[PDB]
Design a protein around this ligand. Structure first.
Ligand SMILES: Cc1cn([C@H]2C[C@H](OP(=O)(O)O)[C@@H](COP(=O)(O)O)O2)c(=O)[nH]c1=O
Ligand SMILES: [Ca+2]
Length: 136
């Protein structure tokens, strides 16, 4: 097993919704592009990209409160995007995407794996429902 750590949620504000799994936030007083941990558009099914983007745009734009939760590993990727779990009024966007079959679990690195089993639980249930990306 990996080490484990207690993560915490930090304040941020929405600057702009980008797509399913990218969002631009004001974090510690500066704009920052964030990439959501542990999710991607399926390699072999991209039909739901627009719906995924619309979904997270609405969720992020309607939220009263956005929070960023970094994991225990790398805080930025090779492009200098933040890597985080993003919360909208306490709801984890990453988890919502997966439960709704709008993106799949992906980019699972041992370093930033704290909510892996949570998201896999959500995925297994979307897959059981043959929902959206899982429909064929
Ligand atoms: C989610 C995530 C993506 N990435 C990188 C892998 C991919 O690199 P490459 O660009 O070299 O393929 C890229 C995919 O991001 P996008 O899916 O936003 O394009 O982000 C990480 O390095 N760590 C992560 O945790
Ligand atoms: Ca994307």
């Amino acid at each position: 097993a990996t080490s484990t750590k207690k993560l915490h949620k930090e304040p941020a504000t929405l600057i702009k919704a980008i797509d399913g799994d990218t969002v631009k936030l004001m974090y510690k007083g500066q704009p920052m592009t964030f990439r959501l941990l542990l999710v991607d558009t399926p390699e072999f099914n991209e039909k739901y990209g627009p719906e995924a983007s619309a979904f997270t745009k609405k969720m992020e734009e309607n939220a009263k409160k956005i929070e960023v939760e970094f994991d225990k590993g790398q805080r930025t990727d090779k492009y200098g995007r933040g890597l985080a779990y993003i919360y909208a009024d306490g709801k984890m966007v990453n988890e919502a995407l997966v439960r709704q079959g709008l993106e799949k679990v992906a980019y699972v690195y041992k370093g930033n794996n704290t909510h892996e089993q949570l998201l896999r639980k959500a995925e297994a249930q979307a897959k059981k429902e043959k929902l959206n990306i899982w429909s064929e």
